[PDB]
Symmetry: C2
Subunit: 190 residues, 2 copies
């Protein structure tokens, strides 16, 4: 049925506004991560930004047109060091999957918008993993485990694919000569 | 010392030519993978192409200028189905790390170009993992295990980050509504 005048319509636009701002913030944090020498983390911020773009697109497509007024609070800034940005991003994700989306979903169900409610709940699942990545990386930075581990393992250069075996990533990739910043733990998800 | 007139100079240009062609082929295969409904594989081809660009750049930077004639054989085509493209790509990687680069490295060492030899050997390591990825994915396609597994596991939508728990990826992402093609096994390499 029509969304016109419902609370859900307002919530969808509110979510769209938040998703849109999150996309920008994450792209900026991605640039900062690159400056801080964390390439894997930089690419993660960029990918997360692209995924927020997709959450926003799904939400945007439900709307039926016209200008709508919304009242909501948003993070006024800021761009800091990568660890701080990861912590702030995780807090944003946390609010979305623990408070905002579950609430929007419940209201949607109550107003009779089952599909939309399902979408809100589904987006919340995505935000929870987004938070996991951000928290895990923040923890790695705090513990000094981004480029060094206790036991020998495999490290992959994101720039050229070189694989290094050892307790930590090398200062310079022996293949492409790029800095340690480009290394990540070798992952196999297939 | 100067590379002028050495066999290594010729080998570097030969490698550069091969690296350059590999970059193009992989980007085309990436596009084909997208058409075949394999997003993770498509992005892998694209990433591999970018890494070949970096192998080529390292090699290119060693050269000292001027036009040089080379004699070498290259794959004249072709673009086929994704499984076939993965197999062909793996064969290309195989020749590079088992025959070409080790040979170029040995010749470089013999002519007194230790740094260059180290680079050839290092690039070979990258190509071996490139082959592993291609062979693994080819195997997944052949066995019908790209989107379905024996035991329940976690699947991530590359488009929006939604996480699905089950034996196989869903036909449609419940969050962004994109097709099964966007799903991959949830990976955590950090
Ligand atoms: Fe989002
Ligand atoms: Fe998110
Ligand atoms: Fe590298
Ligand atoms: Fe290469
Ligand atoms: Fe390769
Ligand atoms: Fe999705």
């Amino acid at each position: 049925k029509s969304l016109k005048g419902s609370r859900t319509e307002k919530n969808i636009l509110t979510a769209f506004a938040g998703e849109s701002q999150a996309r920008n913030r994450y792209n900026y944090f991605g640039g900062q991560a690159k400056k801080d020498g964390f390439v894997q983390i930089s690419d993660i911020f960029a990918e997360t930004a692209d995924q927020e773009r997709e959450h926003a697109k799904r939400l945007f497509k439900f709307l039926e047109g016209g200008d709508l007024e919304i009242v909501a609070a948003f993070p006024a800034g800021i761009i800091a060091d990568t660890h701080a940005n990861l912590i702030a991003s995780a807090a944003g994700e946390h609010h979305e999957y623990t408070e905002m989306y579950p609430s929007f979903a419940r209201i949607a169900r109550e107003e009779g918008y089952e599909e939309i409610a399902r979408v809100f709940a589904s987006i919340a699942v995505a935000e929870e993993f987004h938070e996991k990545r951000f928290l895990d990386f923040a923890r790695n930075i705090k513990e000094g485990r981004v480029f060094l581990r206790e036991q020998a393992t495999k490290w992959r250069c994101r720039n050229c694919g070189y694989v290094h075996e050892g307790t930590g990533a090398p200062e310079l990739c022996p293949a492409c000569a790029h800095p340690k910043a480009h290394f990540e733990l070798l992952g196999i998800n297939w």
